[PDB]
Write a protein that binds this DNA or RNA. Structure first.
Ligand SMILES: [Mg+2]
Ligand SMILES: [Mg+2]
Ligand SMILES: [Mg+2]
Ligand SMILES: [Mg+2]
Ligand SMILES: [Mg+2]
Ligand SMILES: [Mg+2]
Ligand SMILES: [Mg+2]
Ligand SMILES: [Mg+2]
Ligand SMILES: [Mg+2]
Ligand SMILES: [Mg+2]
Ligand SMILES: [Mg+2]
Ligand SMILES: [Mg+2]
Ligand SMILES: [Mg+2]
Ligand SMILES: [Mg+2]
Ligand SMILES: [Mg+2]
Ligand SMILES: [Mg+2]
Ligand SMILES: [Mg+2]
Ligand SMILES: [Mg+2]
Ligand SMILES: [Mg+2]
Lengths: 56, 150, 117, 142, 110
RNA sequence: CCCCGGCGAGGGGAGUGAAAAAGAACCUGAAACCGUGUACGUACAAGCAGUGGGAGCACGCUUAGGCGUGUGACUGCGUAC
RNA sequence: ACGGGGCUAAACCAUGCACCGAAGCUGCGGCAGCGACGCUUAUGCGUUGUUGGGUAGGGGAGCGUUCUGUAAGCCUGCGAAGGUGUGCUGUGAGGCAUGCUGGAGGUAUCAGAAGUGCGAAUGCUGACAUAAGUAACGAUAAAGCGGGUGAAAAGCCCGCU
């Protein structure tokens, strides 16, 4: 099975109307280090909910 | 065209347009359909039509006052400076000079002058008589031209 | 004397593509499709220069019919009355009067009714 | 000088009431189709809806001649295979009396976006009462 | 004062990078950098390096301040494609296009 | 030479030059094709996608000129080569 | 098994008068062919009649492209060719002017010669689309974690399973 006519650039754009990425709504701010992080994820320096959970 | 007579691909089955030679004129690098050959473009002119045209050209020149007749035309030494000075005296810049006997000094003196050329009485041609603004003929040349043109 | 076709071929391809401005899709981009679209557009234009004269007359007649029935007479009897009254106003003007000057149109109906009666 | 053309912004539309009691279905529908389209106005243009708003009362009292009260059949297909439904005239009256007049007029209107816009100006009621008194609709003794 | 940074011949197709580009079109550079940090895309890493390089150009060459910069223009153009041959079944060959892209970021305070 | 970058790639400055939108993927740089921006249209609407009519909007005017340009709601006709 | 709505006439028959209706006919403007009559031609202009759908095909007349002469001329760094817009113009092929780009050639006129005009040939070559960010990532012997290195480690190094 294969196309009988070349689909247009218009049809191609309509199909991709749902391919748009959804940016992260908002980052959480740690209460101790004040860093930004994904909610429910530890920070880049190992903080989570105001606690140094990993020492690296 | 340099190449092989091998059929590029079989006649049927491949799904491509049928081909028989890589030298086909349809193909890139193929031959020319009606490739030229060294040919001869010279036409025939009847003797009377050639002479009849010279008379019509010469008679037209005297009607345009583009034909100047002098008793003699020569220079002492083969130096283009002398000939260039002589033509300036006659108010001539673009001129065809026709003499009875081809003098070497007059021939050498005119070789470097662009708009000037000398010619024997027997060496005239139809396009030269038309190409130049003025045509200067000696009294001997016009006499020889009449015998040439009957 | 080899002649390269590049300059004149591009010129005439642009001439076609310029007349195809505003057409959808390949009809304004690629020459093969645009050329057919331009030829078809010329055919329609030739045909519609004749159709335009029919459609407008058809529109005038409809407006005259409406305005005449506002005065108590049909388009048929109104046109026949004007010819019997030797009035030679055409339908483009009658439809124009019927819209912008009601009282003059009513005067024409009176003239038409008189020629019939 | 170009022929006048009506503009959708500046066209005025009046409201009318029609009592369908005893009227012949078809000969009433043609008069409605004329006024819904605007064929009765001198400013009529084909591509503009210059028609009027029309209210039809007593749609269930519309009349038909001959044996059409029991023999005129209304067909429609539901889109499912074998889904050809039919209903005679008098059961259309008993079930959806407004549909009879709406169907008849819909067939006499132009087909397309403008034709569907003209059809919106038709308000059909089975009974004798309507709640468009705010529009002050004028009696159209047709 | 517009400031431009480009990544030409970026090893990624323009269609994939454009998904990330429209996430930050019009945003402030501080907010755009956070969006790119938490976008799980390879193109997010490419766009982030171009964005922060445009920020550096704006402050070092134009003396602008980071607090006022905004991503006023961003677009991804197609770069040259590298042709590769991939053998398929039954001796047939397919030509693989390794597409590239040109990433352009324009930051500005106005 | 300076800056971003992985002592990258790539880029921004600076400098050279008549020109760097001549920067080595280098004269000119068309078309298909792919984008960004702006104007207008478009989510009750059926078909060779135009054509005739035509509102509205945007914009250039002139300037009360009532013209031009872009778009094209709605509508007649219309089954490519 | 009226094109539909609908119709008891909006059906049928007879008669009559209106109207609608084509690129037919008429009106107004324009073009061309063929006659005729002449002016009187210098061989064109002027009346007048008439004609002007068209495949195969026959006849007639042109446009434009490259090259040769005309041309050691003319145009051109005060911007050529080419590219890209715009306006004007001819019945058409077209032409002219001009903004921007371009950065060095172009060429009147009248003649001459053709590798002289492309949308088709499952044409040839190159470029780029589409399907589509889809199928697939090549044996179902299998991985897990700690440490290291590094801009970055599921895949590299070391270790233990
Ligand atoms: Mg060979
Ligand atoms: Mg060859
Ligand atoms: Mg001989
Ligand atoms: Mg007619
Ligand atoms: Mg570098
Ligand atoms: Mg270049
Ligand atoms: Mg809508
Ligand atoms: Mg139609
Ligand atoms: Mg006729
Ligand atoms: Mg003919
Ligand atoms: Mg130019
Ligand atoms: Mg071609
Ligand atoms: Mg053909
Ligand atoms: Mg392909
Ligand atoms: Mg699929
Ligand atoms: Mg799937
Ligand atoms: Mg899969
Ligand atoms: Mg494997
Ligand atoms: Mg590990």
């Amino acid at each position: 099975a294969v196309q009988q006519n070349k689909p247009t650039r218009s049809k191609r754009g309509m199909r991709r109307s749902h391919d748009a990425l959804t940016a992260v709504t908002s980052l959480s701010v740690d209460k101790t280090s004040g860093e930004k992080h994904l909610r429910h994820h530890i920070t880049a320096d190992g903080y989570y909910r105001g606690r140094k959970v990993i020492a690296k | 065209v340099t190449g092989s007579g091998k059929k590029p691909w079989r006649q049927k089955g491949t799904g491509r347009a049928r081909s028989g030679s890589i030298k086909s004129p349809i193909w890139r690098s193929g031959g020319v359909t009606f490739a030229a050959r060294p040919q001869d473009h010279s036409q025939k002119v009847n003797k009377k039509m050639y002479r009849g045209a010279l008379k019509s050209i010469l008679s037209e020149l005297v009607r345009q006052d583009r034909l100047i007749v002098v008793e003699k035309f020569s220079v002492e030494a083969p130096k283009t400076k002398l000939l260039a000075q002589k033509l300036k005296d006659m108010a001539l810049e673009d001129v065809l000079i026709i003499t009875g006997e081809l003098d070497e000094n007059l021939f050498l003196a005119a070789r470097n002058l662009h708009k000037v050329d000398v010619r024997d009485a027997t060496g005239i041609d139809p396009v030269s008589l038309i190409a130049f603004d003025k045509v200067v003929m000696t009294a001997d040349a016009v006499k020889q031209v009449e015998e040439m043109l009957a | 004397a080899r002649v390269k076709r590049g300059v004149i071929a591009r010129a005439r391809h642009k001439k076609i593509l310029k007349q195809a401005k505003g057409y959808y899709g390949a009809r304004s981009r690629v020459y093969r499709v645009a050329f057919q679209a331009v030829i078809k557009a010329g055919q329609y234009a030739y045909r519609d220069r004749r159709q335009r004269k029919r459609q407008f007359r058809q529109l005038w007649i409809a407006r005259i019919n409406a305005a005449a029935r506002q005065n108590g007479i049909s388009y048929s009897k109104f046109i026949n009355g004007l010819k019997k009254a030797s009035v030679e106003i055409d339908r483009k003007i009658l439809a124009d009067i019927a819209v912008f000057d009601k009282v003059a149109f009513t005067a024409l109906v009176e003239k038409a009714k008189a020629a019939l009666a | 000088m170009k022929t006048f053309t009506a503009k959708p912004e500046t066209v005025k539309r009046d409201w009318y009431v029609v009592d369908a009691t005893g009227k012949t279905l078809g000969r009433l529908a043609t008069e409605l189709a004329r006024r819904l389209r605007g064929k009765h106005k001198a400013e009529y243009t084909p591509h503009v809806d210059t028609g009027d708003y029309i209210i039809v009362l007593n749609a269930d009292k519309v009349a038909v001649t001959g044996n059409k009260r029991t023999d005129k059949v209304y067909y429609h297909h539901t889109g499912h295979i074998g889904g050809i439904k039919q209903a005679t005239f008098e059961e259309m009256i008993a079930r959806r009396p407004e549909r009879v007049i709406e169907i008849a007029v819909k067939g006499m209107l132009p087909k397309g976006p403008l034709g569907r816009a003209m059809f919106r100006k038709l308000k059909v009621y089975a009974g004798n009462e309507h709640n468009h008194a705010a529009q002050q609709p004028q009696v159209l003794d047709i | 004062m517009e400031t431009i940074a480009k990544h030409r011949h970026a090893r990624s197709s323009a269609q994939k990078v454009r998904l990330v580009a429209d996430l930050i079109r019009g945003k402030k550079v501080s907010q755009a950098l956070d969006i790119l940090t938490y976008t799980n895309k390879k193109a997010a890493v490419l766009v982030k390096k171009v964005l922060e390089s445009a920020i550096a150009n704006a402050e070092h060459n134009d003396g602008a301040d980071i607090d006022d910069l905004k991503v006023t223009k961003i677009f991804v153009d197609e770069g040259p494609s590298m042709k590769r041959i991939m053998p398929r079944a039954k001796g047939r060959a397919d030509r693989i296009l390794k597409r590239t892209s040109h990433i352009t970021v324009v930051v500005s305070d106005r």
